[PDB]
Amino acid sequence: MLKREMNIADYDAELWQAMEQEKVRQEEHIELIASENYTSPRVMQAQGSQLTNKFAEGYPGKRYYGGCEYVDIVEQLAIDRAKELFGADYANVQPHSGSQANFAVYTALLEPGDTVLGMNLAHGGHLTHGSPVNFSGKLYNIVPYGIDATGHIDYADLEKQAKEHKPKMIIGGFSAYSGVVDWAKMREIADSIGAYLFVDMAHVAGLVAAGVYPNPVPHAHVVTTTTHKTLAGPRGGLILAKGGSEELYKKLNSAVFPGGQGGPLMHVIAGKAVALKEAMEPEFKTYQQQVAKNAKAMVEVFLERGYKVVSGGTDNHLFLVDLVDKNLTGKEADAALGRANITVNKNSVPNDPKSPFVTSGIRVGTPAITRRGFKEAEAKELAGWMCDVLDSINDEAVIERIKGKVLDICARYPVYA
Amino acid sequence: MLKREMNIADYDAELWQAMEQEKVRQEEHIELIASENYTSPRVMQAQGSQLTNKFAEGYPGKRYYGGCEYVDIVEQLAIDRAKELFGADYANVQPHSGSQANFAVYTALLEPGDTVLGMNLAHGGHLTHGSPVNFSGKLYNIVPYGIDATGHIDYADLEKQAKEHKPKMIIGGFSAYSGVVDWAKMREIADSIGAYLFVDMAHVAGLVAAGVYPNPVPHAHVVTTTTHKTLAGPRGGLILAKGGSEELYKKLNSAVFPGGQGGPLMHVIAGKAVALKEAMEPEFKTYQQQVAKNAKAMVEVFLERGYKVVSGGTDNHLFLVDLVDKNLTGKEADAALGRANITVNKNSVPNDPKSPFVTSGIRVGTPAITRRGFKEAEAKELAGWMCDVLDSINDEAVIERIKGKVLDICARYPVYA
Numbered sequence: 001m002l003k004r005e006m007n008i009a010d011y012d013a014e015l016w017q018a019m020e021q022e023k024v025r026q027e028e029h030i031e032l033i034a035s036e037n038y039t040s041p042r043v044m045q046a047q048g049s050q051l052t053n054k055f056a057e058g059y060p061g062k063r064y065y066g067g068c069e070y071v072d073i074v075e076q077l078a079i080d081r082a083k084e085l086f087g088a089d090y091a092n093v094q095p096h097s098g099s100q101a102n103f104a105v106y107t108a109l110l111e112p113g114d115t116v117l118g119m120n121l122a123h124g125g126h127l128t129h130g131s132p133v134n135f136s137g138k139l140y141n142i143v144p145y146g147i148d149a150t151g152h153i154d155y156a157d158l159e160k161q162a163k164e165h166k167p168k169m170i171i172g173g174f175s176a177y178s179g180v181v182d183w184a185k186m187r188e189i190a191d192s193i194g195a196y197l198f199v200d201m202a203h204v205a206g207l208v209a210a211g212v213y214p215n216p217v218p219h220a221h222v223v224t225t226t227t228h229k230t231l232a233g234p235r236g237g238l239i240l241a242k243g244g245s246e247e248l249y250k251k252l253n254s255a256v257f258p259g260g261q262g263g264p265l266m267h268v269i270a271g272k273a274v275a276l277k278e279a280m281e282p283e284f285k286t287y288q289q290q291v292a293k294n295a296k297a298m299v300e301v302f303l304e305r306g307y308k309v310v311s312g313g314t315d316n317h318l319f320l321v322d323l324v325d326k327n328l329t330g331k332e333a334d335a336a337l338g339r340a341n342i343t344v345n346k347n348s349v350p351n352d353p354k355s356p357f358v359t360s361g362i363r364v365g366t367p368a369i370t371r372r373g374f375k376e377a378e379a380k381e382l383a384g385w386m387c388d389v390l391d392s393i394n395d396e397a398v399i400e401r402i403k404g405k406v407l408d409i410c411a412r413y414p415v416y417a
Numbered sequence: 418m419l420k421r422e423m424n425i426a427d428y429d430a431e432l433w434q435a436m437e438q439e440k441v442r443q444e445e446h447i448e449l450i451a452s453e454n455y456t457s458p459r460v461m462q463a464q465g466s467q468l469t470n471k472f473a474e475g476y477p478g479k480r481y482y483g484g485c486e487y488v489d490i491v492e493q494l495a496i497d498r499a500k501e502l503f504g505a506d507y508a509n510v511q512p513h514s515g516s517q518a519n520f521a522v523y524t525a526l527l528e529p530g531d532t533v534l535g536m537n538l539a540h541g542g543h544l545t546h547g548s549p550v551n552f553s554g555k556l557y558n559i560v561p562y563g564i565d566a567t568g569h570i571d572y573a574d575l576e577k578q579a580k581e582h583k584p585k586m587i588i589g590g591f592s593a594y595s596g597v598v599d600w601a602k603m604r605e606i607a608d609s610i611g612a613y614l615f616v617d618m619a620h621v622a623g624l625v626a627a628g629v630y631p632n633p634v635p636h637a638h639v640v641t642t643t644t645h646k647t648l649a650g651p652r653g654g655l656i657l658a659k660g661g662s663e664e665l666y667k668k669l670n671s672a673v674f675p676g677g678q679g680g681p682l683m684h685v686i687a688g689k690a691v692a693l694k695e696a697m698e699p700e701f702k703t704y705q706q707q708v709a710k711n712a713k714a715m716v717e718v719f720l721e722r723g724y725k726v727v728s729g730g731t732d733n734h735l736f737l738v739d740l741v742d743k744n745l746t747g748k749e750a751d752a753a754l755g756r757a758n759i760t761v762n763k764n765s766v767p768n769d770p771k772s773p774f775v776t777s778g779i780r781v782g783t784p785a786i787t788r789r790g791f792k793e794a795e796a797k798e799l800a801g802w803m804c805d806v807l808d809s810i811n812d813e814a815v816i817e818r819i820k821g822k823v824l825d826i827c828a829r830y831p832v833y834a
């Protein structure tokens with residue numbers, strides 16, 4: 001039946017039409033939506049490989065069915081590289097998503113109905129970290145802890161509510177506009193209660209990978225991350241652990257399979273193995289340093305133009321722009337910048353007068369533009385254009401003026417050259 | 418950074434080595450492991466597309482973030498084709514796996530701790546259908562129902578245990594060696610108790626797609642399936658429903674997102690849309706008829722050679738070979754046929770004297786060989802070779818004799834020509 005050509009575009013016309021229109025969009029839009037990144041052509045071509053036909057159920061070396069003698073090596077490379085890169089003695093590259101990566105931890109260490117002191121969803125919290133609409137909040141009792149006025153973690157507030165409710169696990173996952181997390185302090189608090197320390201570094205994986213952001217793995221029980229964000233990866237999940245007992249490692253192993261999922265996607269795992277090797281390169285370090293370098297350069301521009309930035313400056317690669325004083329909503333800023341081909345997302349400010357859906361502020365990330373080839377001089381130029389739109393918010397002529405400059409710089413700096 | 422070449426093999430040597438060794442294996446091994454199939458090059462090339470960079474969270478037409486104007490069309494094509502093909506007015510192509518596809522149904526319609534009358538795991542039952550090691554059995558109370566001696570469903574036994582325990586949902590998923598399921602009878606039983614009717618046709622999706630196997634969708638509440646088995650698809654899940662209320666459709670919609678998973682894999686969904694179009698072709702029908710035609714031809718050979726086949730003959734594309742009378746174990750039959758490059762899996766027989774891990778029998782499927790180009794004359798030849806190995810089970814010369822013939826027929830009939 002299979003003649004080994006069937007080009008995606010001689011059979012299905014309308015699907016290819018929509019496929020290439022998205023390709024044009026990505027080549028003509030500035031992506032400043034937080035922690036979104038472009039992946040390697042090595043990953044793409046490994047993801048679209050013949051390994052999608054292979055059904056391997058279980059773990060390498062101890063599979064159920066025969067003929068898994070070669071795919072065990074493919075997965076082991078992804079495991080061994082994950083261990084060496086983040087300095088862990090445990091790695092799991094089978095979870096389909098970051099939501100599934102977290103799901104395993106809850107089913108392994110927690111009973112249905114246990115008190116979990118997770119980060120507040122209303123103030124930058126993740127869905128899998130405790131949400132009424134998510135499985136995490138429905139099955140488990142969630143008691144939220146809040147951050148301080150600037151955005152940094154109140155360590156005295158975390159020590160409280162710990163004796164009041166006595167949680168079995170505390171979630172110290174990274175959220176928006178928050179600075180560095182003292183994970184050494186997290187362990188001291190968790191040990192006094194007798195609770196598990198769970199840290200989700202999904203958002204800041206690439207920065208820890210190069211050595212720009214502190215590593216939570218050395219002093220945490222279970223650490224989860226996405227392989228497709230600040231690490232430039234296939235879309236998936238990862239479970240890492242350091243300094244634990246083998247009886248606790250097999251808890252997480254059983255939590256993935258046969259916990260919540262069946263056979264892992266080997267074509268994605270092949271893309272995971274190559275992506276980790278690219279992160280080990282010295283060229284990945286210079287890129288990741290330039291990500292934080294561009295983030296700082298942008299904050300300088302917004303402050304000089306009279307726009308308030310949360311926490312004064314940026315710690316990593318994310319910064320939130322306050323628009324309360326300018327009397328503008330984040331929904332109106334999103335649509336205005338969206339028309340000028342600048343992709344930003346609306347975000348709620350601390351002490352927001354307006355609806356959490358109207359947001360009165362915007363969130364800007366820098367990993368997508370740095371991957372393209374934007375330097376400090378290009379990052380300040382783009383930040384200058386954004387302020388031009390925010391000044392004349394309803395002037396249509398100004399929006400078209402910026403878009404033309406955006407279309408030019410996208411033509412000068414392509415994603416895939 | 419990205420120079421738009423980075424061939425998978427000039428950077429990572431050992432990964433490509435393992436990748437091509439699996440490609441050689443698949444081209445030199447006869448796959449008779451049940452319901453495993455080779456996918457289209459259209460799917461592979463759409464799975465390894467630039468759509469992996471796109472982050473679209475939510476549902477088409479009502480996304481959270483801007484710039485999702487084109488990916489809504491990509492997903493809608495996968496939805497519209499899924500509806501028309503299986504005759505449903507509801508489709509969901511976002512679930513990452515069949516385990517996640519089932520997970521949504523349980524979280525949407527059932528409370529944690531509800532009595533569920535699912536199929537017996539010990540006798541052909543699926544893991545997500547009620548298993549002590551799986552999330553389905555841990556969160557929900559599972560009461561198992563068993564099949565009759567031949568393998569067909571005891572309808573009187575299903576009517577019992579329904580008043581004894583009063584379940585809120587009954588699972589009528591397809592299992593091994595079972596014939597046709599009277600799904601019209603399933604509805605009559607479920608309505609009397611006031612329970613949801615959940616049918617998993619994952620294993621027999623392609624046969625229903627062509628019109629060889631009866632369709633459970635017209636008379637069932639919720640129907641789930643994998644898009645990567647007897648349908649020749651990207652590895653994923655699908656939720657279908659027909660004749661329900663909109664308040665029950667939005668239960669399943671919320672069950673996927675923000676139920677158990679975040680943003681869907683758009684590169685896989687693009688592969689899902691093209692795979693459904695290929696199933697609509699008249700050439701897919703003639704293939705699927707030839708799948709059942711080869712299954713019947715093989716049973717004829719095994720019966721003439723004095724080997725017992727469960728249920729007398731095959732109903733669809735799966736048949737189980739009994740080896741109790743021959744005094745051979747399914748573990749020894751697996752290893753012997755495995756060395757002759759025949760990939761079969763060990764399976765337990767009804768009333769098994771030996772361990773469920775030693776299995777005293779084997780399970781053979783026919784969708785992989787039919788996809789390659791095997792007809793009735795080629796299917797009977799292969800079945801003849803299998804019996805030659807089972808007759809002289811410890812004779813090493815015979816095993817090498819068959820392998821040579823297997824290597825020849827694989828060279829004559831390639832997967833991707």
Ligand SMILES: *Cc1c(COP(=O)(O)O)cnc(C)c1O
Binds near residue numbers: 057262515619652
């Ligand atoms: C079919 C199947 C699944 C579905 O996902 P796979 O990719 O096929 O693993 C899950 N578990 C079992 C036991 C299956 O047979």
Ligand SMILES: *Cc1c(COP(=O)(O)O)cnc(C)c1O
Binds near residue numbers: 678680
């Ligand atoms: C990061 C993220 C996830 C992880 O999976 P995606 O593919 O990025 O969707 C899940 N939910 C939310 C809200 C996320 O930000």
